[PDB]
Amino acid sequence: GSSGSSGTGDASKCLATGPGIASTVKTGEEVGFVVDAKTAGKGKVTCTVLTPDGTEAEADVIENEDGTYDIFYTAAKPGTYVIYVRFGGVDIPNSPFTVMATDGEVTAVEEAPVNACPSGPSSG
C-alpha cells in the first residue's frame, strides 16, 4: 500500500436515506433511495446491488445539483441483498447495506396453459 495526499471528502459525514436501503424491502416493486450529503464534500457515489444468487444487479445513478444521488433498483427474487455504497472512493460506515426482500403478505398465484399453433399454408 501507499498514501500521501490527505483526504478531501468524508464518507462518514454522508447520509443514506430511502426505502430501497431500508432494513427491509419488497420484491417486484421498484425502490428508490437517495444519498444526502451536507459536509461530506465532493465525490462520486457508486451503488452495487448484489443478489443472493451470486450475481450483480443493475443500479441506475443520477447526480443532483444539491449534491445528492438518486438510485433505484428492483428485486426479482427474495433473499439477502447486499448493496455497496461509497463516497468519493470511500466505503461509508453503513456499507455494506443488509437488505431483506420479502414477498409481503400471503397470496395464492394462478397459472394456466396457453395453447399455440404455427402458421403457413398446406398446399397438399
Question: Obtained via which technique?
Answer: NMR
89 vs 8: CA distance, rounded Å: 11
Is there a contact between 21 and 102 (Cβ–Cβ < 8 Å)?
Answer: no
Q: Which residues contact 73 (CB under 8 A, 6 or more apart)?
A: 20, 30, 31, 47, 49, 57, 58, 59, 60
Q: Vertex 51, ends 46 and 52: CA angle to 5°? A: 140
Neighbouring C-beta atoms of residue 31, cutoff 10 Å? 19
68 vs 4: CA distance, rounded Å: 28
Q: What's the CA dihedral at 12, 18, 22, 26 to 10 degrees?
A: -150
For cell 433498483, what's the residue?
Answer: 73
Kindly report the CATH number that applies to the domain delimited by 1-124. 2.60.40.10
C-alpha cell recorded at residue 115: 395453447
